[PDB]
Ligand binder design. Structure first.
Ligand SMILES: [Br-]
Ligand SMILES: [Br-]
Ligand SMILES: [Br-]
Length: 36
């Protein structure tokens, strides 16, 4: 979720995860990715 995402050093994004990151969680009732 957003809290764990940001806490552990990720970013919540609806779009694809940017270059040099990958999906490592979810945010926003499951509709966004946690990228890191
Ligand atoms: Br964020
Ligand atoms: Br992605
Ligand atoms: Br997460």
């Amino acid at each position: 979720d957003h809290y764990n995402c940001v806490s552990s050093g990720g970013q919540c994004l609806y779009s694809a995860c940017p270059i040099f990151t990958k999906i490592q969680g979810t945010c926003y009732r499951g509709k966004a990715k946690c990228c890191k």
